[PDB]
Amino acid sequence: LAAALAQAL
């Protein structure tokens, strides 16, 4: 989930 956020932005 942390990565999901990072990548989306």
Side-chain angles (χ1 to χ4, degrees):
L1 294 166
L5 175 62
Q7 294 187 16
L9 293 174

PDB file of all heavy atoms in Angstrom, unseen atoms left out:
ATOM      1  N   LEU A   1       0.774  -1.205   0.000  1.00  0.00           N
ATOM      2  CA  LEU A   1       0.000   0.000   0.000  1.00  0.00           C
ATOM      3  C   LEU A   1       0.828   1.289   0.000  1.00  0.00           C
ATOM      4  O   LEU A   1       0.458   2.233  -0.697  1.00  0.00           O
ATOM      5  CB  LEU A   1      -0.973  -0.019   1.172  1.00  0.00           C
ATOM      6  CG  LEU A   1      -2.044  -1.098   1.070  1.00  0.00           C
ATOM      7  CD1 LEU A   1      -2.745  -1.286   2.401  1.00  0.00           C
ATOM      8  CD2 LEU A   1      -3.053  -0.804  -0.027  1.00  0.00           C
ATOM      9  N   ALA A   2       1.929   1.345   0.759  1.00  0.00           N
ATOM     10  CA  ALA A   2       2.801   2.516   0.739  1.00  0.00           C
ATOM     11  C   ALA A   2       3.320   2.741  -0.696  1.00  0.00           C
ATOM     12  O   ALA A   2       3.363   3.835  -1.229  1.00  0.00           O
ATOM     13  N   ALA A   3       3.739   1.644  -1.329  1.00  0.00           N
ATOM     14  CA  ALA A   3       4.257   1.703  -2.684  1.00  0.00           C
ATOM     15  C   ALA A   3       3.194   2.152  -3.668  1.00  0.00           C
ATOM     16  O   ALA A   3       3.501   2.888  -4.603  1.00  0.00           O
ATOM     17  CB  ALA A   3       4.812   0.347  -3.108  1.00  0.00           C
ATOM     18  N   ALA A   4       1.966   1.691  -3.492  1.00  0.00           N
ATOM     19  CA  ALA A   4       0.876   2.032  -4.386  1.00  0.00           C
ATOM     20  C   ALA A   4       0.754   3.556  -4.476  1.00  0.00           C
ATOM     21  O   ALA A   4       0.636   4.176  -5.531  1.00  0.00           O
ATOM     22  N   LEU A   5       0.745   4.175  -3.298  1.00  0.00           N
ATOM     23  CA  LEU A   5       0.653   5.624  -3.179  1.00  0.00           C
ATOM     24  C   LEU A   5       1.827   6.301  -3.867  1.00  0.00           C
ATOM     25  O   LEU A   5       1.645   7.218  -4.690  1.00  0.00           O
ATOM     26  CB  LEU A   5       0.607   5.994  -1.696  1.00  0.00           C
ATOM     27  CG  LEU A   5       0.635   7.483  -1.383  1.00  0.00           C
ATOM     28  CD1 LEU A   5      -0.580   8.194  -1.972  1.00  0.00           C
ATOM     29  CD2 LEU A   5       0.726   7.674   0.142  1.00  0.00           C
ATOM     30  N   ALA A   6       3.030   5.845  -3.538  1.00  0.00           N
ATOM     31  CA  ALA A   6       4.245   6.421  -4.068  1.00  0.00           C
ATOM     32  C   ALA A   6       4.195   6.402  -5.612  1.00  0.00           C
ATOM     33  O   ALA A   6       4.461   7.399  -6.295  1.00  0.00           O
ATOM     34  N   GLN A   7       3.833   5.254  -6.168  1.00  0.00           N
ATOM     35  CA  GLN A   7       3.881   5.126  -7.619  1.00  0.00           C
ATOM     36  C   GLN A   7       2.822   5.979  -8.297  1.00  0.00           C
ATOM     37  O   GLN A   7       3.100   6.623  -9.303  1.00  0.00           O
ATOM     38  CB  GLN A   7       3.773   3.664  -8.020  1.00  0.00           C
ATOM     39  CG  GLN A   7       4.995   2.905  -7.548  1.00  0.00           C
ATOM     40  CD  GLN A   7       5.061   1.507  -8.032  1.00  0.00           C
ATOM     41  OE1 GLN A   7       4.361   1.119  -8.963  1.00  0.00           O
ATOM     42  NE2 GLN A   7       5.929   0.729  -7.416  1.00  0.00           N
ATOM     43  N   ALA A   8       1.606   5.976  -7.761  1.00  0.00           N
ATOM     44  CA  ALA A   8       0.511   6.750  -8.328  1.00  0.00           C
ATOM     45  C   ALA A   8       0.908   8.229  -8.472  1.00  0.00           C
ATOM     46  O   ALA A   8       0.589   8.893  -9.453  1.00  0.00           O
ATOM     47  N   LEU A   9       1.616   8.752  -7.472  1.00  0.00           N
ATOM     48  CA  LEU A   9       2.011  10.162  -7.445  1.00  0.00           C
ATOM     49  C   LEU A   9       3.339  10.424  -8.119  1.00  0.00           C
ATOM     50  O   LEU A   9       3.920  11.485  -8.032  1.00  0.00           O
ATOM     51  CB  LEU A   9       2.056  10.668  -6.020  1.00  0.00           C
ATOM     52  CG  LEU A   9       0.703  10.735  -5.311  1.00  0.00           C
ATOM     53  CD1 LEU A   9       0.891  11.118  -3.849  1.00  0.00           C
ATOM     54  CD2 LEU A   9      -0.251  11.690  -6.002  1.00  0.00           C
TER      55      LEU A   9
END
